[PDB]
Structure 1
Amino acid sequence: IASACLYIACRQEGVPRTFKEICAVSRISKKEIGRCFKLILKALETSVDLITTGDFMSRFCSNLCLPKQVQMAATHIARKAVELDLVPGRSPISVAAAAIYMASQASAEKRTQKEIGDIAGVADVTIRQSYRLIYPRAPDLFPTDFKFDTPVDKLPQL
């Protein structure tokens, strides 16, 4: 119950932590926290705003030690990708992780898929799937005033 309450309190305050992040600090598994999470909402008759891809960019990018411009580029990519519906049904975390990878590979600081997965808690396969979906529209997603250390045309293909 406490782990779910901690998750809900984070969501209510505008700084969500993913179920995996709450699980890492608790002996309770993600499955159990999610079960308690839904029950608490019914019991309290409350609701939580739907999470967005940008709700985790600050934590993920900072934890990856990525420059601020990369963080802004990743946020723009993730927001645009959802706007363009290039990743329908994908989890916001996966979209954010893919956007971070796309932004990271376009700057001097390059992070592997495993590195982005560890902080974000998303398996590299899921990042690979999301990255493949947004890769075709890479030039459009990137901010117009973005300095490409690696040209968009030469971004990793996979």
Structure 2
Amino acid sequence: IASACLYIACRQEGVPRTFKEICAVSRISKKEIGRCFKLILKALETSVDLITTGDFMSRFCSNLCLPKQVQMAATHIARKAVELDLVPGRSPISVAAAAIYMASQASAEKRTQKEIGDIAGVADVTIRQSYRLIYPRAPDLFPTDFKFDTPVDKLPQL
């Protein structure tokens, strides 16, 4: 209950923490936290705002030690990807990690899918799938006022 309450508090505060992050600090598994989560919402007759791609960019980019411009580009890419519906049904964490990977690979500070996956809590396959969906539209997702260390046309294709 305490672990699930901590997740709800983070959501209410506008600083969502993924279930994998809350699980990583608690002896309770993601599954049990997820079960208690919905039960508490019913018990409290309350609800929490839907998570968004921008809620994790600050934490993930800082944990990855990415420059400010890379974090801004990743935020824009993820936001535009959701608006363009390029990632239907994809979890926002997977989209954020994929957007971070794209922006990182386009910048001087290049991070691998494993490094981003370990910090974001997403499998490299899930990142790769989410990245493969957004890669064709990469020039539209990147900001117009962004400085490219590696041009969008040379971004990794897979």
Q: Provide TM-score, normalisation by structure 1.
A: 1.00
Q: Distance in 2 between matches of 1:114 and 1:85?
A: 26
Q: Distance in 1 between matches of 2:55 and 2:151?
A: 27
Q: CA deviation at 1:9?
A: 0.4
2:55 maps to 1:66: no
Partner SS for 1:50: coil
Q: CA deviation at 1:97?
A: 0.2
Unaligned runs of 5+ in 1: none
> 1:25-67 CA distances to partner (integer Å, 9 max, x unpaired)?
0000000000000000000000000000000000000000000
Q: Distance in 2 between matches of 1:157 and 1:32?
A: 38
Q: CA deviation at 1:154?
A: 0.5
Q: CA deviation at 1:100?
A: 0.1
Q: CA deviation at 1:2?
A: 0.2
Q: CA deviation at 1:125?
A: 0.3
**Deviant stretches of 4+, over 3 Å:** none
Partner SS for 2:17: coil
Aligned residue for 1:106? 106
Partner SS for 2:157: coil
Q: Distance in 1 between matches of 2:134 and 2:18?
A: 22
Q: Distance in 1 between matches of 2:157 and 2:30?
A: 33
Q: Distance in 1 between matches of 2:63 and 2:96?
A: 14
> 1:106-147 CA distances to partner (integer Å, 9 max, x unpaired)?
111000000000000000000000000000000000000111
Q: Distance in 1 between matches of 2:150 and 2:16?
A: 32
Q: CA deviation at 1:5?
A: 0.2
Unaligned runs of 5+ in 2: none
